[model samples]
Target: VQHPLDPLTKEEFLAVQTIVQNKYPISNNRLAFHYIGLDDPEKDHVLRYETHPTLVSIPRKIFVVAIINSQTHEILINLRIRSIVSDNIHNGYGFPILSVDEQSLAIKLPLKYPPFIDSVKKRGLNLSEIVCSSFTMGWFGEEKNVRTVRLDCFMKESTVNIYVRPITGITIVADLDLMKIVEYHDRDIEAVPTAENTEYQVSKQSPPFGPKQHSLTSHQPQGPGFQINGHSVSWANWKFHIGFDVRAGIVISLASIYDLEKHKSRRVLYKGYISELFVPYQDPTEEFYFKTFFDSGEFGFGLSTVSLIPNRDCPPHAQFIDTYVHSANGTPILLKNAICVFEQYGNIMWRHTENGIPNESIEESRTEVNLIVRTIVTVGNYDNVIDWEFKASGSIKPSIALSGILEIKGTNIKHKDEIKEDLHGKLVSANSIGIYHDHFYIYYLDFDIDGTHNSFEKTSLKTVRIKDGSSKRKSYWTTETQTAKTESDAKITIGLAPAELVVVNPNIKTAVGNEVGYRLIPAIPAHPLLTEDDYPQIRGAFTNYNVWVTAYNRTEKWAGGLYVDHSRGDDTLAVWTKQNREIVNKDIVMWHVVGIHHVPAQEDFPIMPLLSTSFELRPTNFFERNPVLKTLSPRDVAWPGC
Candidate 1:
C-alpha cells in the first residue's frame, strides 16, 4: 500500500532488473544500468488516490535506462503487470550518465598509453604516484555518435589533495565504449603545481590548528514535533512527501499547508525537485574549453551523495533516512543517512511591541522554528548542500549551499604583475590559476496553488506620474498584474524588470476577491556570458531565462536535456519552449534557476567557504490571514533542561 508518488522500493528495483536481464541477458553482453527509478504515475491517478487513499488503486511502474552492447535502451516495466510494457533503443541522439566503472576504465586507459607515460616521465613524475579523473567531453563539433570522457591526470603523493597538484598540459580523450584512448595531447608546459598549503584533512594540518572548539549542541529531550507516515512528513501546519532517486536527489511531492480559517489543508505544490545544475567554466582555450558540465545529467546527484557524518552533517537530533539506488550492475545499494530531517531555531517569525501606551509595556512574538530536510552531494571539487526549509508561516524555502575545494589549473605565472598573454583565469596562488565559472541550479516546482489549474502571473512595479502636478508627490510606484497566456509569455529574465512571479489558482478566490496564489521569490540572477553560437551555451540555453512556466509534461523533467553528456542543444528546455503551448489555467510547472557567476578569489584557494543561495515559495493571497498568529511562543514551549 505504498503511495504512488513514493520512489521505487528495493524489491521493485530487483524485479525490474530481473525482467530487463531476461530480455537482454547479461552473459557475454556488456550491459550497464545507467538509471532505475519509479516511472511517474499519471497525475490524475495520484491526485485521486490522495483524496481516496484506500479506494483508488495505482499501479507500480519502473523506468529504466540501460546500455547494452554500446546501444542505449529505454525500458518501462510495470510490476503490477509483471512485464516490461515498452522498450525503445536510442539511435545515439544521446547516451546515459557515466557510471563509476566507466570513469575508472577511462582513467586507467591514459596510464597505459605510451604518449601519456612518456610525458609524465619527462616531467620527472613517478608513474605510480599519478592519479586521473574523468571529465565529460562536451560537444565541440570534433565528433559525434560516440560516448567518450576526457581524462585529467593529477600528481598525488599519498593522500594530499589531487586537485591542487594537477599534472599540467596533458589531456586524454578515451572512448567509454571501447575503453581506450582515442586521442592524447601534451602541451610542453613543465609546471606541475606544487602541493603546498593544499592539505584539508585535519590529521595532516599544521601545529597551529590544534585548539578545537568546545561542544555546542541543541537537543530536544521530548523529541521532534514532526510525524512521518511512510515517506510523508507532517510538521506543524505543513505536510509533504519525500522521495529519493538516482538523478534528482531529493524529490518533494504534494506539499500542502493547513488553512486554519477554512479548517482544511490546501495544496501549494504537487511536486518539486532540482532539474539540473549547469557549471560552465569561462576559459575558452583549447585545453580548458569544453569544461561545461551538467552535474545531475552526466554524473547524477544521488549517486554522488556521500554518507552523512552524525554531528558534522546535521545536528544530533536530526533523523537520518537510508536511501536506496541501484548500482551499475542493477543491484540495490544503500546510501546511509542520505537525507536528514531536523527542527532548527530560525529567527523571529513575527514580533510586535506595544510601547506607546503610557503606563504599560507589552510584547508579543513567536520564535521561528523551521523543519529542514537536507542532503549533500559531492560533485567533484564542489560539495552542494540541498535544503528544504518549511516555515510554519506558510513559506517553503529551498536552498543550495556550495562548499569545497576550487578546481584550479597549474600555471607558470608566479605573480599577478607578470605580463603575459591571456591565461583565461585569475592567478589565485603562486602557480595555480582558478578559473571563472557559473553555477546554475534549476528547479521544477509544480505549483498546485489550491488545485492543478494554476496560472502564472507577473505583477510589475511601474512608476506612475500624478496627474495633478500641484500635489507634493510627483510620482508613485504601483503594481500591474498580467496573466501569462502561453509558455512564451512566462519566460522571465529577472532584474530586467521589477516584478513579482506567482502561480495562482484561477478558480479559487479569497474573501477579498484576490486569486489564491503562491509567490516565487527567486535568488540573485546570474546570466550566461557565452554567445549563442558557443557550443556550451547552446547546450545550456535554459540559462537565458531565470523562470519558465510550462504545461505539465512528465517527460519534460531534465532542464539541460534528457541525455546531457556531449549532447547538442537539440532537446533542451530552450528547444522545448518552441512549442509555446498555452499555460493559462493549466496544470503548470514553474522552472526556476538560481545562479552564481563565481570568479574564484585568492581566499578560495585551498578550500572555499560555504556560499548559500535560496528561493522561497510564499503564500501571496493563499491564506486568509497571518497563519502564524496562533503559533505558540517560546515561553509556551517547555524547555526540559531549564
Candidate 2:
C-alpha cells in the first residue's frame, strides 16, 4: 500500500510530537527542532514518518529511530527510548546526544566545526589569500565509529572542482556527529601543480574549445511521433509501458514488437530496467572503504531525480512526461519533465548502396528513425544519464552517460616532480589527487520472446583438427554449443572470440526449425574487485560475474536486494544463484554488468567530461528478415540522378 498524499502532514507531525514529548520527554536539558523522516517498505507498506525532537549536546548520535503511522498514529518502529544518556560505546553505552541527518547538511549547521570563513580566520591561516574550496563528510577513518568531515583548500577558489589547483599541505578535519575537532594540520609547502599544461577555465591563458553549434533538429510534428496513453508508448510497430519509480528512474515493461513474418506482435521483452549501479572507488581506508555505493538500491535513482531541462537535458524536439511518485511517507509528489521521449535520426540500421551494377543498377534503402526514452540522475558529484533507444529494426539499446564533478582528495606534495610520497591517485594539481575508481552498471533484462518460456545458450568456437590430415592447416574452428540447463550454468562472466550468449525461445522457431532468439552483446569486460570475504564485496557481490541468468522471480527485481545501506551480501545476486534451480525453457532474466575503470587526467580537473558505456540487445534469428526493410522512406534518397 502507498499513501496518495504526503507524509507527516501538519496533524501527523503533531502525532509524532505528542508521542515524543510523552514517551521520551524533553528532559536532556535540550530541545530545539523536531525531525520527521519517511520510513519505507514497513508499517503498512506505505509512507510512514518517524518524528522526533532534535536534542543538541556535545555532538551526538541517535540511539534508535522509530516510525509512526498516519492512520493509527501508532509507532511503526519503536526501539525503546525514555531519555538521553551519555552512551559512548567504549564502556558499551551512554553516548552523546546530537543530530545526525544527511551528509549534505553538516556545513549548513553553523555551530558545527564545518568551519565557517570566520573559523578559518580564527585558525590564524592566511585564508584571505588562499581559498577553502569544499568540505566532504563521512565516518572518520582514524577515529572509531564517530562521523567526521574533511575540508579541502585550493590555490584560489577554483579547486571546488576536481581538477583545479590546490594549496599544498593544508587539510582540516572535524568531528560532527559529536561535534569536535580531530586534527588541524596546515603546513605551507610548494604550490606547484603536477600537470603544468592542463586548463579548464575560459581564460585566455588556459581554455578548451571556446564554442560550437551542434544541435539536432528536424522530426518535428504536430503531435508526439510516438503514441502515449499515460506511461505506455506505441511507435514503429512496437509497444511498451514506461514509468518512473523513486528507485530506478524509469522501468520499461510489456514490451512487444511487430513481427510480420510471425503474423503478429510478439513479446520481445517482458520487462527491462537498469537494476543497480555499483561504483566503488579505489580507496580502502576506513573512512572511504565502505564507499561501495548502490546508487539505485541505496540512495535511489528516482528519489534523486529532478526536472530535466528541455533542449539541454533533452533535445528541443523532445516531449516531457510527469510522474507522481510516492515519497518515503506515502505522499505522491509530482516531478515534471523528468523523462523525455523523442524521435531521433539514427545511423544506418542496415544500409548499402549498389556500386557495381552499371546503368542497370538496383538499390534499396530506408530512413533509420529511433525512439528514445531518457532521464538524468545526479548523485552528488556524479551525473548519470540513462537512455533506452528503440529502433525500427527491433533492437533495444540501453546506454548511460556519466559526467559531473569528480571526487578528489587533498595532498601536500606541490608538484608530481617533487613528490616523494605515494598517493593512490592521479595528481591533477600541485595539491589535489584524483582517485582511481570504476563505475559498474548492471541491468536486469527479462526476455519473453514470443512467450514467457526461454532458454540461454553460450555458443563457442572450437578448433577441430582435420582428422585425415589431408589439408596443410592442422585445425579449423567449429561450433561448440553449451546450453545453460540450470541456474548455476548461467552464472559467469562474458568474454571474446569463442563465447556468445543468447536467449532463445525454445517454443518459437522459424520455417527452418531454428530457435528464434536475441543475442546478448556486452559492451564491457569488467573483472571483479573484492574477494568473497570482504563485506562491501559481499554487499555488492553482483559484480563478481559480468552477467548472470536467473529464473524469473517476482521479488528478484533489485540485484542489490531491498536494503543496501550497510547491508550484507545475503540479499544480492551472488546469494540469489545459491540454489541451482532449473533455468532451461523457463522464464529467464539476463543481467549484464558494464564497467568503466576511470583514471583521472588533468582535463578531468574541476569537473570530468562526459563518458558513457552500454550494451545492446540484438535480434538474432528472432526475425526472419531485416525488421526495418519495410520502413518507408521519409526523405529523398541519395541517388546519382534521381
Candidate 3:
C-alpha cells in the first residue's frame, strides 16, 4: 500500500545517505557503513549501502561489513566500479583498490570500454592471496578504446559507531560552581571573563552629649506653713492674716473687711514699739522719776509717769509700776479719758568716775538730764487729740534675712549646696529687707470674772482693711521690684485702731471655759538694728533675734501678774544677771532689750509666721476689765482660703 520511497528502496536509501553525508561533514564520520535493508519481494534480492560508497565484487548477501587491515587496524577503501543501473555482463563487476598498505594506485578509466576481463582480473586479486599461474586476460588491440573495471566490494565491513567525548577546562568549571561568574564584565585583551562589583559606604553623625550647667539655683522651704495659703485666718465675714519673710525679717499684714456694722465702728489695732529708750546710768538707791504732758488745748492732760529703782527685786535689775497715772492741778485726774500732750523729764543722781588712782579718788557729783516728748489723745473727741507722727530709719542687715541654714531632708549635709553658695556670695549684693536682733520669750495673762458682774461678757472688735502703697514703688524700703523679675515686691502698712471694739474677752462661767477671750501682745525687738554695726551676742537668750507677738487670753495672767515672766530667782537668773550688767553701761541698751510672753492654744503653734501683729489696748485696772463687754465679738469673721 506504500510507494517504494515511503518504504525506502535500497537505491533511494543510498541516495539519501549520500546527500546527508555531503551536506553535513560533522555527521559524515558518524554514518560510516550504516545500512537500511530494502527487499524486492518478487525476487528476494537484498541490497547493502555504506555511509560512503565502497566497491568489490561484493555479494548482495553481505548486507553491511567493515574492511579493516589486520596490521594497522584501520578501515581500507574499496572503490566501486559498477553502477547499480549498469546491465552489461561482459566486464566482470569488481572494485578498484584505491589504497593498499598505505600506498595509493591511480587508474584512469575510458568512457567506452568492452566488458574487459583484463582490467577486472588485474584489480580483483588480493595481493596477499595470489598464486602464480592462474592469470587470464582479453583486450582490444588498436581501436583507441578504454578498459574499465566496475569497482565493487561486498567484503564484510563492521560499522564502528564513533563518538567524540566533549572536553571542558578545570578553571571554567570551578568558576561556574563557585558562582563567581559576573553578569556584567569589562572586556580584556583576550576576551576572558573576570569579576567586578560596586562598593557601598555609609556616614553618620550624632548630637552633642554632655551635662549642661544652669546659671542660678534657688531654694524654697518644705515646711507646712512655707506656703502662704497655710497661714490663712478665717472667720464670719472678716478675714485677717499676715505673711512673714523670716529670712528677710519682713512682715506683711493683710485683712478683708465685709458686712460692717452700721454706725457701730471697727478698728485694726496693733501694740508694738515705735522706738526703744535705753538708759545706761549706774545707781543703786537713787530714785529716777519720769513725767510726760501733752498740749491739746481743752484735751491737754498728763499721761503716765513712773519712778525707776535699780536692783529693786526685779529679774531685769530695775523695777517700776506696771501701771502708772499722772496728776493735773494737784488732783489725780482720770488719765484714761483725758486729752493730753506728753512732756517727760527724769530727775536722778549721777556719779562721775575718777581718772586717777585709788589714793587720788575725788568726790565729784552731777545731775543727769532725761527728757521725753509724748503725744496724748482723748477718746470720742478728734479735735482734742494730738496728731503724733514718727518715721523709722535704719540700715537693713543680713541677720534679718538669714536665720541659719537648716539641714536638708534625706541628706547628711546640714545645708543645701545652693543655700551655702547664696549665703557666701551669690546673694551678698542683695538688699536686706529687715533685721531682728532681739529674742522675746512668750508668757500668758489670765483674769477671772464674778457671776454678779453685769458687764463681764467677752467681746471682739471689728477688723479694718489697710491699703499699702509701697508695693507700687520700684524700691520700697529694702524690697526691690524690677520689670525683668517675675516675683513681685513685698509691702507692709502699720496703722492705728480703737481698742474698745477690737478686743475679744471669752466668758468664764465655771472659773474656766472651752475658749477664753484674748488680746495679742507683740514683743518688738529691743535692739532692733537699722545699721550693720548693731550685731548682738550670738549665744544665750539672744541666740536667735526676731520681733514676735504672743497672743493670750486675758483670763490667764502671767506667772508674775504681767504678760511676761519677771519672777526673781527663776532659771534665767544667771544669764539675766550677766546681760543686765552688760546693758547698764551700753549706750544701746533699749535697742537690744528682749521681751517674753506665752501664747494661748488658739494661737496655733509653730504659729503661722505673720507679716504683722495686731492688738487692742483696753483700759484694764484703770477702769474695768470689761470696758466693751456690752459689745460682741463678730460672728462673721471670714478669712482667705479658710
Candidate 4:
C-alpha cells in the first residue's frame, strides 16, 4: 500500500523530483531518483531526487529550486536546503535526496544551535553578546541571481549552568562591534530557546555526595538493558526492554525446547478486525470488494502464514490440531469459527457509511445490519519457544490484546438491570465477557473450556473442551481456578506463565515474582481514531474477524504446558517492549502507540501519504536529563567472519 501523499503519476514524480533535487543536489548527482507514470496529461510526469537510504548515510552540501505547480515552471530557482542531515554518517557513503513536488516540499530548515551552548550541562555561554550570527556561506556559483546561502551563528557568554530538562534556553547576545560595523544590530538580538532540555544535575545531598566535597557524576547507558535467548526460554511468556539503533530491525522467533512448563515463548500478537470483503462507504449501489484480514491467513505470494496469528493458537501446534486449515494458496481458514465480532462491525460500517455518508445515516445502517462470527481454533500448547522472523514488509500494523477475565464479584454489574444498563443487553449473567483493555466495552463469551468450571478463567490460559459446550462457546476463556484438569478423553492441555521467568530469571530468580501479575499486555484491535467515544461502533464492526493461536497438550510435559501459554502472550510482548525501552523509554513506547494513529491524507493516497507513520522514543527516566550525551556512532570495525 502506498501513502496517500505518495507520488503516483510520472508527472507528479518529476514535479516532486525537481523540487527535491533543486534543494539537495550534490555534485549534480540526484541520489534519490524514481519514475512514476500517470494516465492524464495534467498529472503525468517523472521525479528524481535523493535521501538517506540507510540510517548511516552521509550528509553533504545540498540545495533546492522551487517549481510552479503543473506548469513545469521554476518559481524559486535556488532555495537553500534547511533540514539537518546528521554529521555522523557511517556504513555507505553518499548524499541522499528525494523527489518531491514543489507543493509537497514542506522542508523546515534546521534550527541554529548556539556555538557556545553546552547541551550536556544545559548551559549557553557567549549567547547574550552576539547580535546575529548565521552559517558561513559556501559559494555554489558566482552569478548573483542564482547563488544560494544558509545562516549559522552563535552567541558568547561568560558562564552558564545546565539543568535536568531535556531542553535548554539561551539568550542570543548581539555582537555589538559586528552590529555597529553592519549597522543592523536591531535585526539580530532575538534569543531562541532550545528544543527540550536534557541536561540534569545530581544533588550534592544525594548518596555518594557531600556539600563540601561533591561526588556527583553524569551517567547515561546505551543499548537496551534486557536480553532474550530464543534458545533458553523457547516457548513461554517473557518480558524484555530493548532498543535498536536507527534504521535497524530485528526478528524474534521461538526456538524449540524440551521443557514444557518452564520455557514456552510466543510469537508476537497483532490485534485488528479481520474481513474477507470491505466497502469503504455505505453505498448499496457500489459493489463489495474482498479486504485483507491479518487473520485471513493470506499474506504474501506463496506464503502459508498471514501476518496475524489466528484465534490465539500458537503456530505449529494449532496447525497440527487441525483447528484451522491452511489452503495451498496460504490462507488459514478456521474450521469452526466464523469472522470475528469486530470484523462484522467493520462490515456493517462499510455497508452504511463507507462512502463518507452522514454520521446519522451510518448509525442507522449499523442498527439494521445483522452479523455473526465464530472462533475456529484455540491457542493451546506449543513448543518451548515461539519465534518471529522479521522480514521487511512495508509498514504492517498488528493488533494485540492486553486483556484479562472479569471477576463476577468484582464486576460492577450484579443484576440484570445493571447488565442491561451497562452492557445494553449484549452481556448477561451467564454470558462470558471479553472486556477490552482500552474501553470498558465487554464482549459476550461464545466459547467454553471443558474440564473447567466456568468458561472464563482468572488465569490467561483456559482450556477448550472439544465437546459438551454450546457451539457458540468454543473459544478461550479466563481460568476460573488456579489449575483446571483436562477431560478424561482430552488429547491436549495449555497454561499461562509469567514473563520474568524467561527474561530476568537468569540474572535474578525473584524478578518474575517481584513483578508478579504484571502481564506484558499485547496490542489489541485499535480504532483509526483515538478516543473512547468511537470504540463502540468500531469494536462491534470487527466481530467478523478471526484470531490466531497454537494449542498443545500438557500431558506431553510440564514445560510444554508452560511453553504454549507463554508463546501465546508474554514472549512477544517482552521482546517488543524491551527493544523499545532500550532506544527510548516506557513513556516513548506509549507515545509510539499514540503516533500510530496519525493517518496520512489524500495527497498521500496516490503515491505516498503527506506524512508517514512515525514514533519518538523520548526519555521518561534512566537519566538526569539528556540521555544521548555519551552516545557514539558505530565505528569502522573489521569483521573477521565477513
The TM-scores, one per candidate, come to 0.97, 0.75, 0.15, 0.19
Q: 392, model 1: CA deviation in Å?
A: 0.6
Tell me which of candidates 2 and 4 scores higher on lDDT.
2
Write the residue-wise lDDT of candidate 2 on 1-642 in tens digits.
Answer: 122112223334344445455544556322222113323222112112211213311111122222222011222322124233321212211111112233334433333444444544554434544543223332212235433455454433333342344444444555543444566654534333433434344462443464787764354434556987656688978988775555666778768898776778888876677888888777775324545567776556776677898888888788888765433223345777888998887466666778787787666655677899998888767899989988878888999898786666656656788667557678876667777788888888888887878999889888889989799998989888789998888977666466878899988788888899999777758776667666666667888888799988866877877545435456788888888889989878888888888888977765667888777888988988777767775564344442
Point to the candidate with the largest TM-score: 1
- Report lDDT per candidate: 0.86, 0.63, 0.19, 0.20
Which regions of candidate 1 deviate over 4 angstroms? 210-212, 634-642
Runs of candidate 3 exceeding 4 Å displacement:
1-267, 270-544, 555-642
Error of 1 at 513 (Å): 0.9
Model 4, 360-428: lDDT tens digits are: 433233211111111221111001111221111101122222111121111233344545433311222
Candidate closer to the true structure by TM-score (higher is better), 1 or 4: 1
Clashing pairs in 1: none
Give the Å shift of residue 268 in candidate 3: 2.1
Name the better of 1 and 2 by TM-score.
1
